[PDB]
Amino acid sequence: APKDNTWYTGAKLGFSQYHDTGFINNNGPTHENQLGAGAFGGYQVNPYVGFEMGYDFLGRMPYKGSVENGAYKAQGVQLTAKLGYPITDDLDIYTRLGGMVFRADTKSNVYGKNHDTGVSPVFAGGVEYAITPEIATRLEYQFTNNIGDAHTIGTRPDNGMLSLGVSYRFGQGEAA
């Protein structure tokens, strides 16, 4: 069908170890964001280019059986153009870039607090994966060689933040 432009949605879990803004440690997986989950909308225009716009955050504890007290990664938006290309009729290699905005409720040890606010450009990349022709997963990563605050600062994990998730396409108006 002439459905070249096709919308989709998805949801993620994520993890962010990050020293480079910290306090120095020896061992210690020091972290800015630590972890989170998220929800996204997106489209493609064929297997050529597309977009993805969504929120990665930490809803205090999304378990809801109680909540975190403060400093949690309350909310944000990431709004990105995307590139995915298949390497088999199974999975795609994936990358996206655009902008981000962020807030986190900075009730904490006064000075011993999180980054409370942000706005910046953003990117991620990794893979996107077919599960059945209307349902997918993706796994995406954002890295730099962090100036990781530690004992003997050569010694860093050199590992970026990562997230992984499911996706589902907008159905209807579609044919082989």
Classify residue 37 as left (phi > 0), alpha (psi -120 to 50) or beta: beta
Question: Backbone phi, then psi, for 161, in 5-degree steps?
Answer: -75, 155
Tell me the domains of the chain and their CATH numbers.
Answer: 1-176 (2.40.160.20)
DSSP 79-112: EEEEEEEESSSSEEEEEEEEEEEEE----SBTTB
SS3 content of the chain, % helix, strand, coil (to 5): 0, 55, 45
Spatial separation of the C-alpha atoms in residues 77 and 56, rounded to whole Å:
7
C-alpha dihedral over 131, 139, 86, 81, to 10 degrees?
Answer: 120
CA 29 – CA 27 distance, rounded (Å): 7
The DSSP secondary structure of 135-176, one letter per residue, reads EEEEEEEE-------STTTT------EEEEEEEEE--SS---
**Residues in the chain, overall count:** 176
d(Cα 64, Cα 86) in Å, to the nearest integer? 38
* Token pair 């403060």: residue: 70
